[PDB]
Amino acid sequence: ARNIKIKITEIPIPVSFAAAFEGERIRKNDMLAEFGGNKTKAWELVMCADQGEVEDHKIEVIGPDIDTIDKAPGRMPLGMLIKVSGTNMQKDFEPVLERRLHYFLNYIEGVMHVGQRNLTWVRIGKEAFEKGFRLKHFGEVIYAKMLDEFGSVVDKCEVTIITDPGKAEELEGKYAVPRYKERDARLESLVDEKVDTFYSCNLCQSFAPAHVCIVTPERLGLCGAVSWLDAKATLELNPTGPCQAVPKEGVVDENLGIWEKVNETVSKISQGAVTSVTLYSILQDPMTSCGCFECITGIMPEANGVVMVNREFGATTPLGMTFGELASMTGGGVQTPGFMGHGRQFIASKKFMKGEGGLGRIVWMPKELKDFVAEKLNKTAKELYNIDNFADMICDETIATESEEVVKFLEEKGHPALKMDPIM
């Protein structure tokens, strides 16, 4: 009634819990228990539930516990179902908390857990068993750390550990896979028009004093590790942090992505260094770049298009500069028209260069990057009405690197960029 929360002083576990225990490699012959991987079926899930469905501090172990093992190794399914209830708890916050599980388990010495969702495997050494470690301590640690780290969004936490072959698969089908599928569907179906607020991150201002990152559903943070949902979760959990909400009000150009509120926020955050920005263009007041960007996109005028280069590429580019020179010219929080720093998920976006005809202007790209991007790039170019395999029209470093050879390849292949209006 008074919204009073009592914090847990220490984790009630016999095994010592410390952050320095991460990354410990523990001998194979000492592996008392091993769940997941190619041997057994293991999964983890954090799901939002109503207050009635989850009871506070209830650790339920279903199936045989690790004591029953009498052989040197162990092999049994493990399913961790975590239910969190709170006033501010949201489904979009579920993927964040679940990630911290990886860390919450690794801080316990004697147990090593790595993986994602149903791809996780956990190895428990016999030293923890001798100290007195059981499966209930998993729930104790998870509950304590969920109430510590996410105490502002989580009120009650219930952890269930399932070891029975039947209930582990039944709960995974009922709960786990639908959550994963709906999360993937939401990740893929989110566009800028659907949402009403963007986010602004200035975490890279420590080395780029003028850089402001604008995170939208179809424009990822150019570091590659911040998404729209990630920005929302960061704002909720850390209100005075680097991620702040930007209302999408006062539109000026829908095609070029110009908003008066966005310009005001960029001007305020960058301490006036940057005045006007465009989210969907690289030639009219482009967004700045800091230096964490994975890929650099540069305008090629003779091809009437754009070329791309990742940081792993060391050879020269048709622009005539390597990745180092492009990074020196582009980064640092300076507005440089014609050059952009971005992540790998932004290439196949419908907002990629929306102000200059879209992604159809991509004419050159490294071979490994093209192979990595080809599926989503072909999907988006099919949205453009191009052929089934649009990536074949994109020149590689092996096919041609000199500008004249690149233009010859584009003319031979009938690249759409040659038939568009002049880029600049």
């Binding site: 952050a19 320095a20 991460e22 990354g23 410990e24 490699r25 080395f207 004093p209 260094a273 230096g291 305008i299 090629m300 005028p301 003779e302 020269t316 048709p318 622009l319 005539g320 500069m321 020179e325 020196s328 010219m329 980064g331 640092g332 440089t336 028209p337 014609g338 500008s403 004249e404 600049m424």
Partner: protein
């Protein structure tokens, strides 16, 4: 730069050393290269882009190959806005009226104060030889300095054109700084200095008088100028320097677009600590050539370190070389340590190891210039990188001593390092460098 790209011939002939016209346009956009490098540029576009591309502040080169120093070329008022380009230089002031013992002491001070800090050689750059009234003794002094053997550049400070006409040929071939142009002798100084294209020092009473004198000198057609801010006091000199720089940059006025020379020995009245305070002030406050009464280690140690820090590119942190860095001649039975390629971190750990007086084989993997924690976060100072650097550097010279010390910040790397280095004994050390000596004594 894209704007100048429109004016380029777009032949991509590679005749300028750059594969594409866009590359050349971006190279001249950054100011690294002037625009005269393109042979095929249209004449009109050249005539316009000369004015369009011309830097707002001119760079002046003084000295020969070994003593070549560039002063000027700044674009911003604060280093965080954009890097500071050319660092300030230090001069030691010799005077005609000084006696032989003082001159010998100052020559020895210049010679002795010379060291290296993180790959850069800290030493006195300029000898400011001033004229006090005796022409014969002034010529004797400049010849004596030239015969001493000190590796410094020369700055002649002489108001009399008659004395300068004889003093200049003594050090004319060394590209000196000719100082002493006024409102009544700049005509006689430009003709003396324009032949060999030497830098000319300009002084007057006040910013308005200085501006008028520089306008007259530019009307004469000479641009290789070094301005002297005036000011009968420290406050006035500071005001003049700040206002000259702000007029050049904020006002976009190229009349004040020249490096400034500040005689700190005259303002401080030869006070060592006041000289240090004012030198630190003018390192950050647009002073390009600071003249001091003397140079010792008490002056040099703070000033050169602060100059090295301030004139570091914000986007290009300083780095040390990679591989094995032998400390205290650590051959046979010496602990092995690993740290990050950061210049600051390497300097700290090397100093701590030197204080301990114990042999140490220090291995520096490639880390991107980031620190211990932020290099691991980026993905450079990983266990795989440390193991690969250990394998390739050649630390296998040792036989028995196999302890490998790791920074306490990266505790996750212990498992990976032990996995990739079964022979090595990975030991996680403490969290701070102050600890280095006491843990190594163990």
């Amino acid at each position: 730069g894209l704007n100048i790209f429109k004016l380029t011939p777009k032949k991509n002939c590679k005749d300028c050393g750059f594969p594409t016209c866009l590359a050349f346009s971006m190279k001249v956009a950054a100011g690294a290269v002037e625009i005269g490098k393109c042979p095929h540029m249209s004449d009109e576009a050249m005539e316009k882009l000369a004015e369009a591309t011309a830097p707002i502040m001119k760079t002046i080169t003084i000295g020969k190959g070994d003593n070549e120093y560039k002063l000027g070329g700044e674009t911003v008022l604060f280093r965080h806005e954009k890097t500071f380009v050319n660092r300030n230089r230090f001069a030691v002031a010799f005077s005609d009226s000084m006696d032989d013992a003082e001159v010998d002491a100052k020559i020895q001070h210049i010679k002795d104060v010379d060291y290296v800090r993180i790959g850069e050689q800290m030493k006195t750059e300029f000898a400011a030889i001033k004229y006090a009234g005796n022409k014969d003794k002034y010529l004797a002094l400049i010849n004596k300095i030239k015969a001493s053997g000190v590796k410094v550049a020369y700055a002649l400070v002489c108001e009399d054109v008659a004395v300068m006409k004889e003093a200049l040929p003594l050090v004319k071939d060394e590209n000196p700084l000719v100082y002493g142009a006024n409102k009544d002798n700049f005509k006689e100084m430009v003709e003396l200095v324009k032949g060999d294209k030497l830098a000319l020092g300009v002084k007057a009473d006040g910013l308005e008088a200085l501006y008028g004198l520089v306008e007259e000198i530019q009307k004469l057609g000479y641009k290789n100028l070094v301005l002297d801010p005036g000011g009968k006091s420290i406050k006035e000199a500071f005001e003049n320097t700040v206002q000259i720089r702000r007029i050049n940059i904020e006002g976009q006025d190229r009349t004040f677009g020249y490096p400034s020379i500040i005689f700190l020995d005259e303002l401080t009245k030869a006070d060592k600590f006041m000289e240090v305070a004012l030198s630190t002030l003018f390192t950050l406050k647009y002073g390009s050539l600071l003249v001091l009464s003397d140079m010792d280690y008490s002056r040099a140690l703070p000033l050169y370190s602060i100059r090295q820090n301030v004139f570091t590119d914000p986007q290009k942190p300083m780095t040390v070389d990679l591989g094995i860095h032998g400390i205290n001649n650590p051959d046979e039975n010496s602990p092995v340590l690993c740290t990050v390629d950061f210049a600051l971190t390497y300097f700290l750990v090397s100093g701590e190891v030197e204080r301990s007086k114990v042999p140490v084989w220090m291995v520096i993997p490639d880390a991107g210039g980031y620190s211990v924690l932020t290099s691991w976060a980026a993905g450079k100072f990983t266990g795989a990188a440390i193991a690969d650097e250990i394998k390739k550097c050649g630390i296998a010279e040792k036989t028995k001593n196999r302890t490998l010390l790791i920074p306490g910040k990266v505790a996750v790397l212990k498992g990976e390092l032990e996995e990739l280095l079964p022979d090595w004994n990975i030991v996680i050390s403490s969290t701070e460098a102050m600890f280095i000596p006491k843990l190594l004594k163990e």
